[PDB]
Every structure is written in C-alpha cells, then in structure tokens.
Amino acid sequence: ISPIFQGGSYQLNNKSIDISSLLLDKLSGESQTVVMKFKADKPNSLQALFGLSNSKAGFKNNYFSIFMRDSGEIGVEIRDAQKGINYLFSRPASLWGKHKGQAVENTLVFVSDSKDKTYTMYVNGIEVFSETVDTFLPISNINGIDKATLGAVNREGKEHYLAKGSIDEISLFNKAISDQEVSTIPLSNPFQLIFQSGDSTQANYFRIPTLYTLSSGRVLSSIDARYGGTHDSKSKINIATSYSDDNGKTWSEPIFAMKFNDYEEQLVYWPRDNKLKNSQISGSASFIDSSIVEDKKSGKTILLADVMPAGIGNNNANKADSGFKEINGHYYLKLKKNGDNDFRYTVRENGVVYNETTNKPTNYTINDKYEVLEGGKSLTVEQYSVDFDSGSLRERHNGKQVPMNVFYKDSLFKVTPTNYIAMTTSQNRGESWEQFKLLPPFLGEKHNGTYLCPGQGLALGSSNRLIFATYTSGELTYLISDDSGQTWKKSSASIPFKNATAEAQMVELRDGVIRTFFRTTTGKIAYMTSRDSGETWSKVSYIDGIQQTSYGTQVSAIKYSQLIDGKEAVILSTPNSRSGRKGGQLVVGLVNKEDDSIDWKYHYGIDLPSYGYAYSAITELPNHHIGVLFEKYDSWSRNELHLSNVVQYIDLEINDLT
Ligand SMILES: O=S(=O)(O)[C@]1(CNC2CCCCC2)C[C@@H](O)[C@@H](O)C1
C-alpha cells in the first residue's frame, strides 16, 4: 500500500504547520497508520508532533494527537466528547534526543486498527504499547474534525502543545499495516539491543548490565533477565550472557549463566497501572546483580551474582544469619526439612546431607546443581507459572516436573531464607557456564552475606590477583583470590554510612594501586584508594563536579589503555543529576602522576539532561572504542517500572568524548 499523504522537512519552531488541505480529504476508512521520522533535541515540556482536531468552539475535547514529553515519553490521545471517549495511551522513556552531538532521527510508527480494535505504537523499532479496546475510535472519525496539524493541536482556534523540533518525514496510510510490514521500515537508530524482549531468555525485562573485554578480544556481557516486571528480588530473575567477537557490532543469542527452574521462563506483559504495578512474583527463587572478571592464570572467565531463595529479596532476607554453620573451622550450608521448626541439617563434603541432632549422614545428598537426591535418585517438584487472568497475580502449578532444588519453595530440604553469593566459571569465554557454587560467609555465622557490586571484578595487571567488590552495612567488603577463584578472602574497608547501597567499581591506576568509585547517600560519588593490591584501604573522599540523587545510582568505571592529552585516563559512567536517574554522562579524568589525584576534564552527555540514564556498564573495546550498555530510563521512578527494551548499547570513540 502506498501512502495517502507524504511530506517532509518540516521545522517546528513553536509554530504549528497546517496541512489540512493536503491531508484531511485523503483520510478514509476506519484504520490508519502514521509513520513519522522526527528530531527533538530541545523539546518543550509537553508537545504534540501531530494532531487531527475539531478546531471549533465547544469541541475542545475532540482530537487525536501524537505527543511527547521532555522526559522522553511518547503517547497518543484519542478524544470525542459526543462519543464519550477519552483515550490516552503512552510509555515513558521511548525516545532518543542526541547522540555524538547530533539530533537523533526517531522513527515512529503508530497503527490504528479498527478490525482488531487495537492501537499500537512503535518507536525506533521497539513496540512501546499495544492496547485493545471495547469501543474502537477511528482517529479520523472524531466528530467534526476540520484541522490536520504538525507541531500543535488546534483547539478552539488556538495552538495547544506547541512543539519545538523537526519532522523530517511523515506518511499516512489508510490501512493498519502488519507487524511484518512494520519490521521492514528502515530505522536510523543510534543504539543496538544485546538483550531484548522475545529473545532466548524469554524475559520481557532486563536490568543491571555488565560489560567486560576478554583477552581474546571477545567482549562479554551479563544481565539480570527479569521475568516479573523490572522488580528486584523477590521475583524470578536469571543471569544471562551474550558476547561479541566483532568489537560490539553483533552479539550472540543469549544463554544463561545462572538459572532456576522452579518457575517457568514466561514472557509476560507486566501491568503498569497503579493498582497492579507492584504485583511481584513471590514464590520464586532468583539471582540478581552479576559481576564478571577474567583470570589470566587459568584463562577461565568468572561470574558472580547474588542468590535469593524462593520468595526472598533484600527486603525480607534474614539479616542475622549467614545460612551456614561453623563446625571445626569450616562452614556448612544449613537445611530445614519439611515439617521441622529448625534447621537440623547441614550439607557436608560430597553433598552428603547430615542430621545435626544425631550427627549422622542421611540417605539424602545434594548434587552439583544444588538438587536433592534420595538414594542417588533425583527428587522433583512441580513447576509454577504466573498469570493475571483473574485480574490479579496468581502463581500456580503448571503440570511440569523439574529437579528438586534446595533453593525452591516446594523442596523437601530448604536453605535459610537469606541472601548468598554464588560463582560460576566458563572455559570457552561465555559459550557455556558451569554449575554455580556458593561462596562461604566472610563476616561470620550470624551475619547475612554481603551484596555483590554489579559490573566488573578487577584482575590485577602485575599478578594473578582477582578482586570482586561487595558491600554491606558500614563497609565495602572486597573479595580477593590469588588462585583462580578457588579460595577467597575478605578485605574490609569502612565507609561513613550505615545501610547504604554502596555499589562500587574499581580501576587499577598503576601497578598495585586500585581506586574504587562508589555510590553513596550524600549526592556525591565517593572513592577510596589501595596501594597494596587491595590489602589495605584509604579514607573516603568525594568527587566534585558530578551530582547524584540522595539515594544514588551505580557508577561504572574503567582505566583507558591509551594516553589522553599525554596523561593516563580513567572514564566514569553515571547519571549527572540531583533530581532523578537522568542526564547520563561519560566523565573523562586524567591522572596526576605526582599524587594520583584525578582532574575530571571532559564530560560527554550520553543524551539529553532530562532523558533517562540509570545503571550502566562500560568497557574499552579491543579497537579502543568505548562500549556502553545502560539502562536508558529512570529505574528508580515508580512511573517507569516494567518497560521493555530500554537497556541499550552504543559505540563511542574517545574523540566523541573530548
Ligand atoms: O585491563 S583489563 O582489566 O584486563 C580490561 C581489558 N583491557 C583491554 C586492553 C586494551 C584493549 C581493550 C581493553 C579492562 C577492564 O575494563 C575489562 O574490560 C578488562
């Protein structure tokens, strides 16, 4: 089908453009598609890009509009007072503003389908909403429509929602074009997706990106594949990985590094309305917050993540219990059997389940996958699925049997309801991952596990030392291994906050000198330095010139391999904002060789100050470009929960930064 109207290069400079004569009498039938390529790098707070309205006195509420906000939100209104219909559909964080100093051409496709009674919006190749209604209102069947407008809506003769931006191309069709047809429309995206809705994970949501450049040149990424909306644990979340062998140009279909199967991997559209949006999968085990390092010694890749038993997250984890029992200098995983009121069991060497009241082995063992065996025979549990068919969240058995795991709700033997850290390794650079092992507790029997800092671990350049930053109340707790992650020791570093989410990332400034940058509750990013490969740590200082919110956001950090302005360089990625998670920046600092202080010299705005930027991952690609995988939305805001395909990847060169 050919367009019934096509036009382009319209400048919207706070003055609408009337295209009624060109468009109105071409509109026919009850189904329409609008295709629009547009730029808006300095949008007004709220502005219409396109409008069809009744401009007459008395009919102010009779119009169709496609509108955007300076927050990045896109949406439509479809309104007809006579019909008693006022439809508004939208999604936050759907737009790009600028990339590498140039306004981004967004590609918008809106489909109004009378046959299916469905309105669907795509932006930059991503479906941001699809809504079916009982009473369909065709966009050009609004009573008394007499104006077609760009850059405003004509209401009662006056310009409402005046726009600043440009419409490079606009086309309309008297048909609802298929999803297939939509896929053929060319895009001008400044970004790519590594993980995405409908991929191999079957998670509709993702959070907590990581990136790490391996010695082979392979670039590896990990992520929370989150099934029950974007909620932190408790939920169902797996850890997924993908890699690129061509400097980030293309990426492998994701596989899992850590997964549980007590609940089905379901691609679910999580409700965003105020009544149901806090619906949360409450009986599933999960993993959350991963971190990657490569070991030069063995060549193995190592990935850690937090582990949460069924129904457990940070909010309800038992804080006074590691989940392990100390018996003769060694730590053993505690287990509670169905029916008991105490944890009367432990898991000893070779997975033998021991009875603590009788100090005798049982006929039960735990295999490498933390699954329960009786007499060497695999026990099973029935898997759960979730649905909203009854109007609220339901979690129910689905008929399928899966191996019984001690992290599950339905297991005969269950671990302590608290948080743990696990580790897995890969011997083929992310092509497959081993079964995960639990790390031991580092701060005693009666202290819950520390929390992994998402992102990268640190491999020291001049030794075989590996360090993973973690945090808990009152300190950073660095985990240190000198034997390829076979054994770990802690190095504690006090910080001046209680109960902070002190997400920390490290860079090696020079041989044995580690600077750690971390999130606080002060509105400023902090740092500390070690000069002995992580054995001891300095007092805490703070970075000026960057602002965060009171609650803070993860900061990612790397040491760049090449000199910049003749100096060693570190690069930080963070939102720069005191208001919310937005205003994403890369900040380039040069190291003063005389005292290791850093002059934060260059700031690169990832996109508009008002557009979303939350958790982030950066890595120096093998060709010396910079890869950034980041949450392009406000992942703190309760208005921006459960958005799909907002974790995005871009490629930058150093010259773009400076
Ligand atoms: O120096 S490493 O710690 O081994 C690392 C890799 N640097 C290479 C060497 C220079 C070319 C590309 C990046 C930096 C971390 O951010 C990880 O991506 C791993």
XYZ file of C-alpha atoms and ligand atoms in Angstrom:
677
model
C 0.000 0.000 0.000
C 1.166 3.493 -0.977
C 0.815 6.499 1.329
C -2.277 8.682 1.002
C -0.080 11.521 2.184
C 3.672 12.060 2.299
C 5.635 15.156 3.270
C 8.895 16.143 4.897
C 11.491 18.593 6.172
C 9.052 20.445 8.449
C 10.573 22.738 11.058
C 8.552 23.017 14.250
C 9.697 26.226 15.916
C 6.882 26.918 18.372
C 4.554 27.494 15.419
C 2.243 24.813 14.066
C 2.001 23.905 10.379
C -1.450 23.469 8.863
C -1.688 20.505 6.475
C -5.478 20.096 6.471
C -5.862 20.824 2.755
C -3.190 18.271 1.943
C -4.376 15.529 4.275
C -7.969 15.670 5.509
C -9.884 14.644 2.370
C -7.448 11.789 1.742
C -8.407 10.068 5.006
C -10.863 7.209 4.565
C -11.969 4.024 6.290
C -11.528 3.279 9.967
C -7.898 2.056 10.051
C -4.806 4.239 9.780
C -1.021 4.045 10.048
C 1.164 7.066 10.750
C 4.875 6.848 10.007
C 6.981 9.723 11.254
C 10.702 10.415 11.326
C 11.422 13.295 13.682
C 14.047 15.062 15.772
C 13.537 16.858 19.047
C 16.746 17.684 20.874
C 15.293 20.635 22.775
C 11.670 19.633 23.356
C 9.189 21.719 25.281
C 7.825 20.116 28.441
C 4.857 18.630 26.616
C 4.324 18.958 22.900
C 2.262 17.482 20.070
C 4.066 16.358 16.952
C 0.864 15.680 15.039
C -2.785 16.497 15.541
C -6.165 15.889 13.948
C -8.805 18.023 15.644
C -12.173 19.696 15.552
C -10.970 23.269 15.935
C -14.459 24.713 16.519
C -15.762 26.491 19.626
C -17.284 23.986 22.047
C -15.358 20.930 20.829
C -12.052 21.409 22.630
C -12.027 17.730 23.603
C -12.427 16.349 20.073
C -8.966 15.496 18.744
C -6.341 12.882 18.011
C -2.751 13.749 18.835
C 0.665 12.129 18.918
C 2.548 13.812 21.759
C 5.848 13.593 23.600
C 7.250 14.935 26.890
C 10.740 16.264 27.672
C 11.143 13.151 29.823
C 11.327 11.007 26.667
C 7.729 9.778 26.991
C 5.662 9.243 23.814
C 1.920 8.805 23.529
C -1.398 9.494 21.885
C -4.746 10.960 22.804
C -7.941 9.938 21.012
C -10.900 12.027 22.144
C -14.511 12.622 21.121
C -16.901 14.281 23.591
C -20.028 13.200 21.741
C -18.972 9.546 21.837
C -17.886 9.900 25.456
C -14.401 8.576 24.684
C -11.168 9.959 26.137
C -8.332 7.538 25.395
C -4.751 8.186 26.441
C -2.021 5.632 25.777
C 1.661 6.289 26.457
C 5.017 4.940 27.633
C 7.827 6.787 29.406
C 11.410 6.579 28.121
C 10.628 5.775 24.455
C 12.795 8.369 22.698
C 16.318 9.464 21.829
C 17.356 13.121 21.839
C 21.014 13.442 20.801
C 23.927 11.135 20.032
C 27.518 12.289 19.467
C 26.396 15.913 19.350
C 23.736 15.331 16.692
C 19.961 15.325 16.999
C 18.714 11.738 16.623
C 16.177 10.879 13.922
C 13.499 8.932 15.800
C 11.327 6.628 13.735
C 7.750 6.451 14.988
C 5.070 4.087 13.724
C 1.526 4.317 15.037
C -1.063 1.753 13.960
C -4.804 2.315 14.440
C -6.560 -0.976 13.694
C -10.364 -0.976 13.655
C -10.638 -4.678 12.844
C -8.706 -5.786 15.927
C -9.768 -2.646 17.807
C -6.130 -2.131 18.729
C -3.793 0.845 18.859
C -0.066 0.069 18.623
C 2.954 2.361 18.892
C 6.486 1.579 17.759
C 9.434 3.905 18.237
C 12.890 3.135 16.849
C 11.810 -0.440 16.116
C 10.524 -1.069 19.614
C 6.888 -1.676 20.432
C 6.193 0.692 23.316
C 2.471 -0.053 23.662
C -0.319 -2.131 22.165
C -3.819 -1.554 23.507
C -7.097 -3.286 22.645
C -10.377 -1.505 23.463
C -14.041 -2.495 23.665
C -15.198 0.623 21.837
C -12.839 1.490 18.998
C -12.490 5.117 17.963
C -11.030 5.556 14.456
C -8.680 8.539 14.534
C -10.390 10.349 11.672
C -13.910 9.500 12.798
C -13.835 12.081 15.577
C -16.963 14.257 15.318
C -16.324 17.422 13.284
C -12.586 17.086 12.587
C -11.527 20.013 10.394
C -7.806 20.517 11.059
C -4.687 18.415 10.428
C -1.720 19.918 12.230
C 2.012 19.452 12.803
C 3.712 20.737 15.938
C 0.491 21.515 17.832
C -3.165 20.617 18.287
C -5.692 23.198 17.107
C -8.249 23.558 19.890
C -10.903 26.258 19.571
C -8.680 28.147 17.140
C -5.612 28.186 19.370
C -2.300 26.299 19.275
C -2.087 23.832 22.167
C 1.017 21.788 22.984
C 3.275 23.834 20.682
C 6.317 21.824 19.635
C 9.966 22.562 19.176
C 11.671 20.025 16.914
C 11.555 18.820 13.323
C 9.608 16.326 11.272
C 11.936 15.078 8.556
C 9.349 12.701 7.145
C 5.690 11.964 7.685
C 3.481 9.475 5.867
C -0.082 8.263 6.457
C -1.826 5.146 5.164
C -5.494 4.147 5.094
C -4.610 0.713 6.433
C -3.385 -0.896 9.647
C -0.049 -2.267 8.470
C 1.052 -5.623 9.854
C 3.814 -6.162 12.378
C 5.752 -7.740 9.493
C 5.423 -4.638 7.341
C 6.498 -2.503 10.319
C 9.708 -4.526 10.583
C 10.689 -3.510 7.031
C 10.564 0.245 7.674
C 14.188 1.442 7.810
C 15.484 2.901 11.067
C 18.166 5.412 11.994
C 18.923 4.095 15.473
C 21.962 5.373 17.385
C 21.869 2.222 19.531
C 21.510 -1.530 19.354
C 19.973 -4.155 21.598
C 22.027 -7.021 23.001
C 19.301 -8.439 25.205
C 15.686 -7.909 24.144
C 12.067 -8.988 24.588
C 11.353 -12.229 22.747
C 14.955 -13.389 22.795
C 16.247 -16.719 24.099
C 15.850 -15.697 27.745
C 12.116 -15.184 27.265
C 12.329 -12.406 29.912
C 10.327 -9.339 28.914
C 12.552 -7.146 31.088
C 16.240 -6.574 31.823
C 18.281 -4.612 34.336
C 21.815 -4.428 35.733
C 24.056 -4.550 32.609
C 27.723 -5.520 32.729
C 30.472 -5.482 30.067
C 33.955 -6.926 30.078
C 36.640 -7.193 27.398
C 38.354 -10.602 27.361
C 41.998 -11.237 26.339
C 40.886 -12.912 23.097
C 39.156 -9.729 22.021
C 35.755 -11.207 22.742
C 33.567 -8.710 24.574
C 31.279 -10.347 27.105
C 28.053 -9.017 28.632
C 25.889 -10.178 31.530
C 22.497 -9.001 32.786
C 19.521 -9.668 35.078
C 16.915 -11.345 32.902
C 13.864 -10.259 34.927
C 10.587 -12.011 34.320
C 8.177 -10.460 36.830
C 8.459 -6.923 35.530
C 11.578 -4.905 36.421
C 11.233 -5.533 40.202
C 14.299 -6.523 42.274
C 14.069 -9.819 44.140
C 11.829 -11.243 45.346
C 10.901 -12.232 41.780
C 12.003 -14.640 39.086
C 15.324 -13.461 37.682
C 18.063 -15.381 35.873
C 21.534 -14.193 34.844
C 22.035 -14.128 31.071
C 25.145 -13.547 28.981
C 25.924 -12.630 25.358
C 29.231 -11.898 23.618
C 30.563 -10.063 20.576
C 33.567 -11.129 18.503
C 33.481 -8.107 16.218
C 34.024 -5.152 18.565
C 30.359 -4.860 19.601
C 28.850 -4.767 16.092
C 26.942 -8.029 16.571
C 26.043 -10.138 19.594
C 25.318 -13.828 20.203
C 21.889 -15.128 21.177
C 21.866 -15.046 24.989
C 22.458 -18.101 27.136
C 22.043 -18.460 30.890
C 24.938 -18.254 33.327
C 22.725 -18.869 36.362
C 19.131 -20.049 36.304
C 16.482 -21.654 38.464
C 13.572 -23.682 37.117
C 11.043 -23.656 39.974
C 9.085 -21.150 37.869
C 8.625 -21.196 34.077
C 10.511 -18.734 31.906
C 7.486 -16.675 30.806
C 7.448 -13.623 28.574
C 4.801 -11.586 30.389
C 3.388 -8.099 29.915
C 3.610 -6.778 33.477
C 0.768 -4.372 34.398
C 1.771 -0.707 34.696
C -1.397 0.663 36.297
C -1.402 1.987 39.838
C -3.445 -0.854 41.251
C -1.330 -3.749 39.975
C 2.165 -2.460 39.145
C 3.628 -3.631 42.470
C 2.453 -7.154 41.741
C 5.507 -9.272 42.391
C 6.368 -12.935 41.871
C 6.524 -14.098 45.459
C 7.315 -17.772 45.472
C 10.248 -17.986 43.024
C 13.956 -18.317 43.667
C 16.191 -15.846 41.815
C 19.642 -14.432 41.043
C 20.420 -10.715 40.999
C 23.306 -8.335 40.286
C 26.129 -10.070 38.407
C 29.799 -9.196 38.003
C 32.495 -10.521 35.616
C 36.276 -10.939 35.659
C 38.809 -12.857 33.544
C 41.626 -14.818 35.145
C 44.956 -14.604 33.291
C 46.316 -17.658 35.046
C 43.730 -20.292 34.057
C 42.180 -18.323 31.241
C 38.788 -19.001 32.875
C 36.007 -16.432 32.889
C 34.413 -15.980 36.325
C 30.946 -14.639 37.030
C 29.440 -13.985 40.451
C 25.887 -12.990 41.377
C 23.662 -12.749 44.454
C 21.358 -15.733 45.036
C 17.930 -15.466 46.638
C 15.953 -18.494 47.823
C 12.276 -18.704 46.919
C 10.247 -15.653 47.897
C 13.321 -13.851 49.203
C 14.771 -10.445 48.343
C 16.726 -7.751 50.179
C 13.593 -6.521 51.979
C 12.867 -9.813 53.744
C 16.232 -11.630 53.862
C 17.212 -12.749 57.363
C 19.963 -10.241 58.231
C 21.216 -12.087 61.316
C 22.126 -15.364 59.632
C 24.698 -16.379 57.018
C 22.830 -19.595 56.274
C 25.948 -21.617 57.109
C 27.037 -23.475 60.249
C 30.643 -23.377 61.511
C 31.883 -26.821 62.528
C 35.644 -27.121 63.170
C 36.783 -24.019 61.293
C 34.687 -24.918 58.253
C 31.324 -23.654 57.036
C 28.424 -25.896 56.036
C 25.153 -24.981 54.309
C 22.215 -25.364 56.690
C 18.996 -27.120 55.656
C 15.470 -27.308 57.052
C 13.394 -30.420 56.315
C 9.654 -30.338 55.581
C 7.846 -30.300 58.922
C 10.666 -29.195 61.221
C 10.740 -25.892 63.074
C 14.523 -25.621 62.995
C 17.427 -26.152 60.623
C 18.533 -29.577 61.826
C 20.592 -30.455 58.765
C 23.812 -29.472 57.006
C 25.424 -30.218 53.642
C 28.934 -31.669 54.064
C 31.656 -32.947 51.758
C 30.424 -34.509 48.514
C 26.973 -33.117 49.197
C 26.106 -35.555 51.962
C 23.117 -34.285 53.927
C 23.899 -34.645 57.624
C 21.497 -34.723 60.556
C 22.705 -32.300 63.229
C 20.620 -33.657 66.107
C 22.101 -37.122 65.548
C 25.355 -36.239 63.752
C 24.763 -38.995 61.206
C 24.552 -38.951 57.410
C 21.117 -39.318 55.827
C 20.169 -41.101 52.657
C 19.933 -37.655 51.036
C 22.662 -35.921 49.039
C 22.977 -32.578 47.233
C 24.411 -32.701 43.699
C 26.450 -30.031 41.913
C 23.245 -28.237 40.869
C 22.057 -27.907 44.486
C 19.405 -30.501 43.696
C 18.114 -33.083 46.180
C 18.752 -36.803 45.687
C 17.420 -39.693 47.750
C 19.458 -42.896 47.446
C 21.075 -41.326 44.397
C 17.664 -40.739 42.810
C 16.570 -37.288 41.605
C 13.604 -35.930 43.513
C 11.369 -33.463 41.685
C 8.888 -30.645 42.290
C 6.100 -29.306 40.124
C 6.938 -26.069 38.293
C 4.944 -22.851 38.704
C 3.666 -20.383 36.114
C 2.152 -16.937 36.644
C -0.838 -15.155 35.082
C -3.143 -12.187 35.567
C -6.193 -13.892 34.022
C -8.288 -13.434 37.157
C -7.384 -9.753 37.369
C -4.658 -10.131 39.988
C -1.344 -12.024 40.046
C -1.697 -15.761 40.531
C 1.112 -18.270 40.908
C 0.154 -21.876 40.240
C 1.467 -25.336 39.370
C 1.732 -25.940 35.624
C 1.897 -29.754 35.429
C 5.628 -29.936 34.682
C 8.187 -31.699 36.917
C 11.656 -30.225 37.459
C 14.604 -31.302 39.642
C 14.026 -30.512 43.307
C 16.422 -27.735 44.391
C 17.128 -26.615 47.963
C 16.510 -23.004 46.891
C 12.896 -23.777 45.954
C 9.616 -23.235 47.834
C 8.446 -26.823 47.267
C 11.693 -28.598 48.202
C 11.877 -31.282 50.901
C 15.046 -29.558 52.168
C 15.314 -25.769 52.101
C 18.138 -23.309 52.755
C 17.988 -20.346 55.128
C 15.793 -17.529 53.754
C 18.642 -15.061 53.317
C 20.928 -13.766 50.569
C 24.009 -15.607 49.295
C 26.764 -15.057 46.754
C 27.423 -17.655 44.069
C 30.138 -18.040 41.471
C 30.209 -19.825 38.126
C 33.012 -20.179 35.596
C 33.284 -20.614 31.836
C 36.099 -22.357 29.979
C 35.062 -21.217 26.500
C 34.678 -17.470 27.080
C 30.934 -17.439 27.648
C 29.848 -20.256 25.335
C 28.779 -22.314 28.352
C 28.781 -21.831 32.120
C 29.439 -24.373 34.880
C 27.016 -25.080 37.690
C 27.288 -22.340 40.294
C 28.906 -22.838 43.700
C 28.035 -20.844 46.807
C 30.812 -18.729 48.268
C 31.418 -19.123 52.027
C 30.410 -16.429 54.505
C 33.159 -13.832 55.141
C 31.804 -11.993 58.190
C 30.716 -14.842 60.457
C 27.919 -17.344 61.039
C 25.387 -14.785 62.199
C 25.795 -12.126 59.506
C 23.911 -12.272 56.207
C 26.006 -12.384 53.036
C 27.380 -9.168 51.589
C 25.926 -7.760 48.364
C 27.844 -8.108 45.095
C 28.694 -4.880 43.290
C 27.300 -5.267 39.768
C 29.636 -4.786 36.844
C 33.240 -5.880 36.575
C 35.570 -7.529 39.014
C 39.214 -6.477 38.787
C 42.117 -8.526 37.500
C 45.403 -7.002 38.644
C 47.882 -6.365 35.831
C 51.073 -7.467 37.551
C 49.891 -10.512 39.488
C 47.246 -13.228 39.350
C 45.067 -11.448 41.936
C 41.302 -11.222 41.373
C 39.062 -8.884 43.344
C 35.286 -8.589 43.488
C 33.834 -5.594 45.336
C 30.857 -6.258 47.600
C 29.119 -4.107 50.214
C 27.194 -4.388 53.454
C 26.247 -2.087 56.307
C 29.167 0.142 57.194
C 31.754 -1.120 54.730
C 32.963 -2.264 51.378
C 33.935 -5.913 51.558
C 36.391 -6.815 48.819
C 36.657 -10.468 47.908
C 40.175 -11.460 46.927
C 41.503 -14.592 45.268
C 45.046 -15.421 44.158
C 44.209 -18.936 42.943
C 41.729 -18.501 40.071
C 38.769 -18.155 42.412
C 39.256 -21.485 44.148
C 39.624 -19.752 47.511
C 38.590 -16.293 48.645
C 39.489 -13.942 51.465
C 37.906 -10.663 52.512
C 39.425 -7.231 52.886
C 37.139 -4.870 54.799
C 37.075 -1.124 54.222
C 34.936 1.048 56.489
C 32.776 3.720 54.936
C 30.907 6.539 56.753
C 27.358 5.327 56.030
C 25.029 2.823 57.579
C 22.647 0.920 55.297
C 23.938 2.348 52.028
C 23.676 0.737 48.640
C 27.424 1.199 48.207
C 27.793 -0.201 44.688
C 31.497 0.049 43.905
C 33.678 -0.375 40.823
C 37.471 -0.436 40.656
C 40.241 0.727 38.338
C 43.952 -0.032 38.608
C 45.701 3.360 38.258
C 49.179 1.833 38.264
C 50.798 -1.404 39.454
C 49.177 -2.363 42.767
C 47.243 0.919 43.056
C 43.446 0.488 42.995
C 40.923 3.317 43.079
C 37.363 2.293 43.870
C 34.490 4.578 42.876
C 31.201 4.064 44.712
C 27.604 5.068 45.226
C 26.624 6.841 48.466
C 23.687 8.637 50.116
C 25.310 12.089 50.013
C 24.545 13.089 46.424
C 28.212 12.706 45.578
C 30.163 9.757 44.218
C 32.885 8.642 46.607
C 36.212 6.903 46.249
C 38.958 5.230 48.227
C 42.437 4.074 47.218
C 44.533 0.999 47.929
C 48.268 0.958 47.285
C 48.896 -2.674 48.143
C 46.712 -4.592 45.684
C 43.640 -4.388 47.913
C 45.135 -5.404 51.261
C 44.526 -2.004 52.861
C 42.326 0.981 52.061
C 42.461 4.780 52.469
C 39.834 7.068 53.963
C 36.911 8.028 51.733
C 36.896 11.130 49.525
C 34.241 12.538 47.232
C 34.131 13.662 43.628
C 33.057 17.222 42.910
C 31.579 18.138 39.547
C 29.192 15.197 39.447
C 25.797 15.101 41.151
C 23.664 12.112 42.094
C 20.346 11.861 43.913
C 20.191 11.254 47.662
C 19.566 7.565 47.023
C 22.309 7.356 44.365
C 22.952 5.209 41.295
C 25.549 2.599 40.351
C 28.663 4.097 38.773
C 30.764 2.212 36.222
C 34.461 2.914 35.777
C 37.438 1.861 33.647
C 41.099 2.646 33.138
C 41.560 3.598 29.472
C 44.539 1.870 27.782
C 45.782 4.945 25.857
C 47.038 8.323 26.980
C 44.764 11.316 26.598
C 46.400 14.757 26.450
C 49.582 12.898 27.395
C 48.090 11.625 30.654
C 46.665 8.374 31.990
C 42.887 8.362 31.871
C 40.004 6.908 33.821
C 36.412 7.043 32.493
C 33.294 7.129 34.700
C 29.711 6.465 33.598
C 26.858 7.772 35.753
C 23.744 9.891 35.652
C 24.609 13.517 36.446
C 21.514 14.795 38.220
C 20.318 15.693 41.723
C 16.689 15.044 40.782
C 16.465 11.590 39.248
C 18.254 8.972 37.165
C 18.760 11.039 34.020
C 21.414 13.189 32.363
C 23.712 10.302 31.546
C 27.379 11.215 31.174
C 30.753 9.734 30.494
C 33.279 11.712 32.508
C 36.916 11.564 31.491
C 39.515 12.117 34.198
C 43.265 12.496 33.768
C 45.593 11.180 36.478
C 48.186 13.441 38.114
C 51.321 11.279 38.204
C 52.606 13.108 41.291
C 49.853 12.331 43.783
C 47.339 10.103 41.942
C 44.672 12.798 42.078
C 42.310 12.985 39.113
C 41.319 16.021 37.072
C 37.853 15.371 35.651
C 38.478 17.231 32.416
C 35.846 16.137 29.879
C 32.116 15.467 30.246
C 30.152 13.729 27.469
C 26.352 13.861 27.600
C 25.027 10.425 26.530
C 21.669 12.027 25.689
C 19.549 14.954 26.971
C 19.805 16.040 30.623
C 16.110 15.207 31.000
C 16.291 11.732 29.363
C 16.699 8.575 31.439
C 20.021 7.019 32.412
C 20.394 4.593 35.316
C 22.679 1.604 35.877
C 25.484 1.360 33.314
C 28.338 -0.751 32.008
C 31.369 0.463 30.099
C 34.317 -1.253 28.537
C 37.231 -0.399 26.287
C 36.643 -2.420 23.127
C 39.684 -4.100 21.551
C 39.801 -1.378 18.857
C 39.950 1.329 21.572
C 36.341 2.470 21.077
C 34.155 2.589 24.184
C 31.130 0.299 24.551
C 28.304 1.449 26.837
C 25.409 -0.821 27.819
C 22.999 1.126 30.018
C 19.502 1.400 31.430
C 18.015 4.164 29.271
C 15.252 5.095 31.731
C 14.707 6.089 35.332
C 14.877 2.743 37.106
C 14.119 4.411 40.455
C 10.902 6.172 39.385
C 7.670 4.367 40.206
C 6.276 5.835 36.973
C 8.815 3.986 34.793
C 8.514 0.411 36.024
C 8.163 -2.509 33.618
C 9.407 -1.000 30.360
C 10.774 -3.263 27.616
C 13.926 -2.802 25.534
C 15.291 0.149 27.464
C 18.666 -1.430 28.275
C 20.638 -0.323 25.224
C 24.157 -0.373 23.762
C 26.074 2.356 21.940
C 29.593 2.602 20.485
C 31.693 5.705 21.131
C 35.146 6.933 20.159
C 37.371 8.919 22.509
C 37.216 11.923 20.225
C 33.426 11.993 20.734
C 34.109 12.339 24.453
C 36.707 15.114 24.227
O 42.832 -4.344 31.553
S 41.751 -5.316 31.928
O 41.386 -5.215 33.333
O 42.263 -6.686 31.657
C 40.320 -4.985 30.897
C 40.743 -5.080 29.440
N 41.576 -4.020 28.842
C 41.736 -4.248 27.382
C 43.128 -4.000 26.937
C 43.259 -2.851 25.963
C 42.391 -3.035 24.747
C 40.985 -3.346 25.102
C 40.706 -3.477 26.594
C 39.793 -3.641 31.358
C 38.517 -3.951 32.104
O 37.622 -2.912 31.970
C 37.998 -5.156 31.467
O 37.304 -4.868 30.274
C 39.212 -5.970 31.189
